[PDB]
Design a protein around this ligand. Structure first.
Ligand SMILES: Nc1nc2c(ncn2[C@@H]2O[C@H](COP(=O)(O)OP(=O)(O)OP(=O)(O)O)[C@@H](O)[C@H]2O)c(=O)[nH]1
Ligand SMILES: [Mg+2]
Length: 167
């Protein structure tokens, strides 16, 4: 069976686990449980191709950045998450693409930039077009999601598998 290794990266609270847990189970996690490291496996049909996604839900907690170089080496596609209601989390995501490329040593790593928490449109600190621009300087897809939408999360993970197939 083909198998894809995806690392979900970002700062604390942005919604990494709520996005991953919505893909894997169809449920929205409301109670913030800070994450050390968690692996999930889910059989995916993208373009009608049956594969496995193995998903690495990292910690955005400052200490575990020691591990990040191992995660980047052991991983094929990367979902880079910011919360659009927190512009510091948008700022924390910009060095991370280039950190991905120092370890991988080539330019075209399959990445997607995600502005999560779009359902909280009142609280928005980061505009669509700031993210949209970052994604195009980075040459990657851009999505704004709400971990509350099964449909929005599903498209995110299906597009990471499409990205790992035209890499
Ligand atoms: N409104 C809204 N809340 C969200 C969304 N995604 C996550 N949350 C909430 O944000 C909080 C943090 O979400 P998590 O996904 O647990 O955070 P994380 O980014 O995995 O955090 P770390 O594990 O510390 O890296 C929780 O209370 C979630 O319920 C979203 O799309 N919309
Ligand atoms: Mg988490």
């Amino acid at each position: 069976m083909r198998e894809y290794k995806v690392v979900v990266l970002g700062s604390g609270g942005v919604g990494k686990s709520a996005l991953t847990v919505q893909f894997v189970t169809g449920t929205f996690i409301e109670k913030y449980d800070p994450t050390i490291e968690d692996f999930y496996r889910k059989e995916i049909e993208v373009d009608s191709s049956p594969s496995v996604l193995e998903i690495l839900d990292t910690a955005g907690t400052e200490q575990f950045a020691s591990m990040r170089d191992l995660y980047i080496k052991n991983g094929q596609g990367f979902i880079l998450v910011y919360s659009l209601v927190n512009q510091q989390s948008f700022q924390d995501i910009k060095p991370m693409r280039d950190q991905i490329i120092r370890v991988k040593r080539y330019e075209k790593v399959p990445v997607i930039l995600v502005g999560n928490k779009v359902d909280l449109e009142s609280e928005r600190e980061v505009s669509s077009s700031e993210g949209r621009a970052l994604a195009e300087e980075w040459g990657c897809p851009f999505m704004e999601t709400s971990a509350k939408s099964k449909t929005m999360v599903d498209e995110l993970f299906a597009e990471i598998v499409r990205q790992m197939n035209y890499a």
